[PDB]
Design a protein around this ligand. Structure first.
Ligand SMILES: Oc1cccc(-c2ccccc2)c1O
Ligand SMILES: Oc1cccc(-c2ccccc2)c1O
Ligand SMILES: Oc1cccc(-c2ccccc2)c1O
Ligand code: FES
Ligand code: FES
Ligand code: FES
Ligand code: FES
Ligand code: FES
Ligand code: FES
Ligand SMILES: [Fe+2]
Ligand SMILES: [Fe+2]
Ligand SMILES: [Fe+2]
Lengths: 388, 106, 388, 388, 105, 105
């Protein structure tokens, strides 16, 4: 729907994934932190190309499409919440209920036949671990757990994070994150020295193709993803050579991190342990539009009580966020941006020349192609089209 | 009243539509599909158009404003941008006179 | 010409209007005030996508297309008017008469066979009521009155106003203008409090469809337009309610305004009386290109002598212009802008969900579709294309 | 390839030239001066839409495509030259030899099967006369002399110049430079007064069409070009008249310049003598992308020894660069920019109205169409496309 | 007043012949079936020679921009051409094509 | 050593491809094109794709990753984005047994 069909016909292994420029419909996605959305203070965001309004009413989150049914303006140009349970479009005062989107009043015409006979699109919203998830999909949502990596929802796991808008397509973000060899770009990160990490420059793979990954499609909660097992039969590279001469070394610190790396639908990476041996990193790359994504970074650490939580929160603000979320992952941001031009015309999906560590990326591409719950199209954005 | 006299069945050709205006209520549309008769609300559910000014193609009425369409038997949308089903009204022929219900089904 | 044919096939009631993205050719349009164009100082503007030059010579206005026949540069990059009656292209010195556009000299080659054989496009220009009108069309023009609202050209009617460039398509400005329910956006206008207006929030319509408007296609001077009669059988809304509770009231001032509202081809609204019981508002939405229009506002007040006119001007400056042309109509500007995205891809013309008061808008769309004098196309802009 | 086929069908005289929006492949182009690139300091540029890297190793220039084979990033985002003879991609450490582009190492996987089996595109580079030329082409280059005007490469000829980026398509630059009648735009140049040039306003052609130009299809060095002979039988126009009245005079100075003017593939103008009787100007219009070119300006003067060269250098900096390269050619820059709109939709190539002095331009378009060595396409930029 | 062009047999149907005139602008002579027509050679839209164009029935297509004229009436038949061509009287007399040195009206 | 015995001719249906693994060396692909056999390197020259997981169309193998392709007789690219020729291995069928050369060309 989204890409030149001549290109889709070439990429037989993963055409759905190449077509999913706007992301995958019918999944849960995080879009902000709980503390960023206050009672009666509606917030605008764009997710999978759709303009949405979120509001908190009696503490509960509600999500409406930020587009009046009448003449297609954003309600948010001038929000008019006149009662606690409704929003009134500023234009002709069509009035909608937060709770089901039903057009329940029209101030400019109380006798109008449209009253009670139209419904503004609503989306399910759920807060978990201080994060706001929207189900950008149709009908009854599945459990959140389906679209979260293992352990993110564990009872004791305290989650802190950061979110920002990055100018690349979401798929470039996913591939960069799950790419075993991209670790090269991190060799001079302030975290490697200042947190005493062991960090190789890359990996010489071993064994066969099937052993490079573990495809998970039998998890009881229905989650779908891929573990990167390059390090199980591979020799890590600590001495980088040109013409047999050593020109760069890896890092020989004591702390072992990133024993398991997995990517999960709809596009969330889990690195464990990271950035410290007692912590985990979970990061989402959430499609906003064809050119941009939320980089939704979270760090998880088991905390057993409120004293530990506060201690973690203080370590996060003073150490982990500046040293790891920024000091390590800032290089990922500009890496992602550097691939935009090659893939922007969709030709990079044909012309890329892969090597052996990209087996992990290929496994993800095929997983995502087979198990996604639907392809978002520009028609979902503008209004679905069908001729009898 | 419960049954509203429309016209004689012979006063409608196959593939035509008649509007039925009602005091105190919204208009209906009656459709002749072959020898059978169906009725819906006359106002398109996508807007303010009159479906009786549309085009009937078999049992599908096409709205004249935006090209949305409905199945006249079921009232269900058949073409975008229509999404809200029409009210369906029972039609009966008694002594070759067409009658349409004054209240919709369900 | 201008829009995907699949969309035009869907909008059976008003396809020519939907196709008329660049506006209607073969009408008069106001583009500036007489006092903005001085003897022998050519001015540039863009009208219906076309770059034009206007000059005053011996007090009379002349209009040439601002595009040299030779290599298609704008003459206005470096204006060389070397004689009273001519303009010389700055590039190779092709020289054109203001009066008929004839290529009368070429300074770089006075023996050229092109001299006397080519003609640059000219358009008729007429000044009336201190306003400069250009007939953006072919052949001898109709009378200006055909394309003006009733009373605008009245001998005693004194016209003052304001012009500026607005970032929306012209049709969004027209529809917003003529839309009876859009009065809602004006409910907190300073004009309402500070000039003591009666102003409802909207209208509950009454009567049949035909009674909601009066279509004028039988005016003696050839004017074609629609009167909005919603308030003839309608109950005006002064108490807006949600769930039966009053949430908003209209304005209960003394001064009655906007008794008659009419829209005229090519796109000029007349509001009578407004913004005071003894005045009228006439405003044009003039197509510049697909994305922009002139919002050309005028206020009329009958005046008998220079005493009345001067007093009108002082009041215009101190009250009507700031309080009405700006304080009221500024909200119309961003309302227009807010519709851009829905209609930008032409899908808004299909997906809009109309209600009862939109019957006025529909009447205008049909009138405009049936009685416009031609659809401007990109080929008009670039150069007409045909094989006979 | 590059233009609507309905337009190429109309321009039967010169369809390949009209199609050559991105320039001609398989020619040499100057891109910078030798002094602008120092030992071991790689420099980025874009030429015929291709991002390139140039490095100086042991005095010699090498040119690699600035696009990693693997994921299509620009190497120049973060240059890593880890050995004298190599460059290492910053992303996954693919390493390439400057000399032949071979992928000789991958630091992140030294056992990769890709090593020694892939080649980054290289282009030949040659320095001549202080200028850096790149052969933007495939296979063994022809001699540089093929693509330079006569005398530019003479042993004694001292070349100084200036380079900048201009916002027009390269062809608009070429045509402006070679256009006999464009001299009108220079009528007020400081050079004309301050170097006492004779400069007509234009020329009234004499003789037949065929005598207006001399096409060179040479097969000793293989150069291809056209001389402008309008002044051989033409009458110089020193007074410009409108309606028989004199409105402008040419410049009646003593110094006669621009005896011969010729344009050569791939798009380099020679004006001899200029801007003084003892000197020549050679200027290239080098395609960067569809909208941009290098205006690569050079002044040449035969010099026998070091103190002649030194003196020439001082006169260039104090006089010829500011009075001629800027004071004269600055008007050429904005003239070229004024033609962009008309040719931007490619319709100017059909709608232009040519006159007699445009025979030179026509001879160039035909020469260029017949003798270019290939049309650069967007597929050369992204990667050549072919289906069995 | 009359210029001798060629034998009628010298020109095939659907062909064009340039007529150079000393001291004057060139003409084009067109054979449409067995009839002959003459116009100015120079395209009114620019400086093209129409004799280098393509004849399709009674319509000459200009080689520069694809403008076209009806060769009998000299009226433009395709864009971008807008200015009519000068038409010149042709007579065949005794197997010989002749063109009027002057344009008609 | 040189010739390697791959399989019974009959073990391959027409239009199919078989991967031949080789200790200490890159896998080969054996193609059955009607009743004829051909052999190349298995690894696409453009990437890491297995040509044995692609699509045979006559004597042209289409890579499953990017739709590049090769003539399996000559090893030359038939479709972009492949530009580097495949190593080709000589094949002989003797007594319904498929043998592939030890080394290229
Ligand atoms: O996206 C990511 C976020 C955080 C850490 C890693 C990582 C992976 C392997 C080794 C070291 C760090 C990563 O890829
Ligand atoms: O475009 C416009 C300009 C000025 C006034 C009105 C208006 C219309 C109805 C009621 C009150 C004012 C308007 O629509
Ligand atoms: O821009 C230019 C580039 C090269 C030559 C001239 C030139 C031509 C004729 C006479 C004098 C100068 C020019 O204007
Ligand atoms: S656009 Fe929202 S009520 Fe009209
Ligand atoms: S009003 Fe019927 S389709 Fe829109
Ligand atoms: S572009 Fe105006 S005279 Fe040449
Ligand atoms: S993009 Fe250059 S090595 Fe991966
Ligand atoms: S010169 Fe003949 S069509 Fe332009
Ligand atoms: S890996 Fe075979 S075509 Fe790319
Ligand atoms: Fe990373
Ligand atoms: Fe308004
Ligand atoms: Fe110049």
């Amino acid at each position: 729907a989204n890409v030149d069909e001549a290109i889709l016909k070439r990429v037989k292994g993963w055409a759905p994934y190449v077509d999913a420029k706007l992301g995958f419909r019918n999944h849960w996605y995080p879009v902000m932190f709980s503390k960023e959305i206050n009672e009666g203070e509606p917030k605008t965001l764009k997710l999978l190309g759709e303009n949405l309004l979120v509001n908190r009413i009696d503490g509960k989150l509600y999500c409406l499409k930020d587009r009046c049914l009448h003449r297609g303006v954003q309600l948010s140009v001038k929000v008019e919440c006149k009662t606690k349970s409704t929003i009134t479009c500023w234009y002709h005062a069509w009035t909608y209920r937060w709770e089901d989107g039903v057009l329940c009043d029209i101030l400019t015409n109380p006798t109008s036949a449209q009253i009670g006979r139209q419904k503004l699109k609503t989306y399910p919203v759920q807060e978990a671990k201080g994060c706001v998830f929207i189900y950008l999909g149709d009908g009854d949502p599945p459990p959140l757990a389906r679209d979260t990596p293992p352990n993110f929802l564990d009872d004791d796991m305290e989650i802190l994070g950061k979110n920002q808008i990055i100018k690349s397509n979401w798929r470039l973000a996913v591939e960069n994150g799950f790419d075993p060899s991209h670790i090269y770009i991190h060799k001079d990160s302030i975290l490697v020295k200042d947190n005493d990490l062991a960090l190789p420059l890359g990996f010489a793979p071993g064994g066969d193709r099937k052993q490079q990954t573990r495809v998970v499609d039998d998890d009881v909660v229905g989650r779908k993803g891929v573990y990167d097992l390059i390090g199980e039969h591979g020799v890590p590279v600590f001495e980088g050579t040109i013409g047999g001469e050593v020109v760069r070394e890896g890092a020989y610190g004591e702390k072992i991190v990133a024993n398991d790396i997995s990517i999960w639908l709809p596009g969330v990476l889990k690195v464990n342990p990271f950035p410290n041996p007692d912590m985990m990193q979970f990061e989402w790359y959430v499609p906003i539009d064809e050119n941009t994504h939320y980089y939704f970074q979270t760090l998880g650490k088991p905390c057993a009580n409120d004293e530990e939580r506060k201690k973690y929160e203080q370590e996060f603000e003073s150490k982990w966020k500046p040293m790891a979320l920024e000091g390590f992952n800032n290089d990922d941001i500009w890496a992602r941006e550097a691939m935009v031009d090659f893939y922007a015309d969709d030709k990079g999906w044909v012309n890329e020349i892969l090597f052996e560590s990209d087996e992990a990326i290929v496994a993800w591409r095929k997983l995502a192609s087979e198990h996604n719950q639907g392809i978002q199209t520009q028609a979902h954005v503008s209004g679905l089209e069908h001729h009898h | 009243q419960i049954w509203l006299k429309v016209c004689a069945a012979s006063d409608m050709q196959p593939g035509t539509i008649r509007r039925v205006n009602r005091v105190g209520a919204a208009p209906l549309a009656v459709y002749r599909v072959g020898d059978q008769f169906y009725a819906t609300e006359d106002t398109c559910t996508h807007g303010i158009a009159s479906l009786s000014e549309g085009t009937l193609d078999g049992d599908v009425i096409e709205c004249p404003f935006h090209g949305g369409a409905f199945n006249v038997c079921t009232g269900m949308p058949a073409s975008s941008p229509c999404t809200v089903p029409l009210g369906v009204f029972e039609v009966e022929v008694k002594e070759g006179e067409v009658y349409v219900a004054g209240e919709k089904k369900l």
